[PDB]
Design a protein around this ligand. Sequence first.
Ligand SMILES: Nc1ncnc2c1ncn2[C@@H]1O[C@H](COP(=O)(O)OP(=O)(O)O)[C@@H](O)[C@H]1O
Ligand code: BEF
Length: 104
Amino acid sequence: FLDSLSEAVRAQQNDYYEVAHRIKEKIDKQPSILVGGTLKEYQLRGLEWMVSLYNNHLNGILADEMGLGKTIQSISLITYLYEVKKDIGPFLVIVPLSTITNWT
Ligand SMILES: Nc1ncnc2c1ncn2[C@@H]1O[C@H](COP(=O)(O)OP(=O)(O)O)[C@@H](O)[C@H]1O
Ligand code: BEF
């Protein structure tokens, strides 16, 4: 699976972990767009993890327990990408109606 997957990734470029995360990147600072507080270490790790997925053309799941700032992390993802990759738009977020204004 991994072999064919990594080859699928190579098509998308046109152990398991290091293979899946062949392209790496990390960042000590949060995206400068972000205001209203700072990110927690693990959130930063999560960001880096998501960034790695981006770099390796992989999709993934933020399965961190609950109430751990994923909303913020996804926002930081947006701003990260905009400050680093600079592909501003089009970016879609889909949420429950009961959570709309929490997100806004
Ligand atoms: N780095 C952070 N700085 C400040 N508050 C945070 C941070 N991470 C999480 N929070 C708290 O959690 C909320 C944001 O995420 P929340 O909705 O609580 O969890 P999730 O986004 O995982 O559902 C905010 O109310 C905030 O107070
Ligand atoms: F992941 Be949060 F608790 F919506």
